[PDB]
């Protein structure tokens, strides 16, 4: 039996206020994949890889157990490749593309929002293991 699981994915980010002197980093950020509902996806997810930019140490980051999140600091925006592997090697990995957002849009800045959130939706489809 093939099943559908809605997921959300993307990132949050917070401005430090002032650039850290040592590395010029201006933000803390967390990239993630979550189920939409409050459930445990490690029943069907073996692992989730977050390919960070090459300026990061060991840029291929792997999370084997929830929560599926990576938290870092940074100063610039870049594309992250997210790859979800299923428990079964039958099932094709889901590949997702996400631009890491640091800088608040001017609209959300003017509405008073403290933290940036760039979140997208998807539906994972797979056979029950």
Curated annotation (Swiss-Prot):
GO cellular component, one term: nuclear membrane
Keywords: Chromatin regulator, Coiled coil, Growth regulation, Isopeptide bond, Nucleus, Transcription, Transcription regulation, Ubl conjugation
Designated name of the protein: YEATS domain-containing protein 4
GO biological process, one term: regulation of cell cycle
Keyword Phosphoprotein appears in the UniProt entry: no
Region (Diacetylated histone H3 binding): 75-79
Cross-link (Glycyl lysine isopeptide (Lys-Gly) (interchain with G-Cter in SUMO2)): 19
Region of the whole protein represented: 19 to 147 of 227
Tissue spec: Expressed in brain, heart, kidney, liver, lung, pancreas, placenta and skeletal muscle.
Function, in words: Chromatin reader component of the NuA4 histone acetyltransferase (HAT) complex, a complex involved in transcriptional activation of select genes principally by acetylation of nucleosomal histones H4 and H2A. Specifically recognizes and binds acylated histone H3, with a preference for histone H3 diacetylated at 'Lys-18' and 'Lys-27' (H3K18ac and H3K27ac) or histone H3 diacetylated at 'Lys-14' and 'Lys-27' (H3K14ac and H3K27ac). Also able to recognize and bind crotonylated histone H3.
One of the record's GO molecular function terms: histone H3K18ac reader activity
Domain of life from the UniProt record: Eukaryota
Domain notes: The YEATS domain specifically recognizes and binds acylated histones, with a preference for histone H3 diacetylated at 'Lys-14' and 'Lys-27' (H3K14ac and H3K27ac).
Site residues by UniProt (Interacts with diacetylated histone H3): 55
Subcellular location: Nucleus
Domain YEATS residues, every copy: 1-129
Assembly information from the UniProt record: Component of numerous complexes with chromatin remodeling and histone acetyltransferase activity. Component of the NuA4 histone acetyltransferase complex which contains the catalytic subunit KAT5/TIP60 and the subunits EP400, TRRAP/PAF400, BRD8/SMAP, EPC1, DMAP1/DNMAP1, RUVBL1/TIP49, RUVBL2, ING3, actin, ACTL6A/BAF53A, MORF4L1/MRG15, MORF4L2/MRGX, MRGBP, YEATS4/GAS41, VPS72/YL1 and MEAF6. The NuA4 complex interacts with MYC and the adenovirus E1A protein.
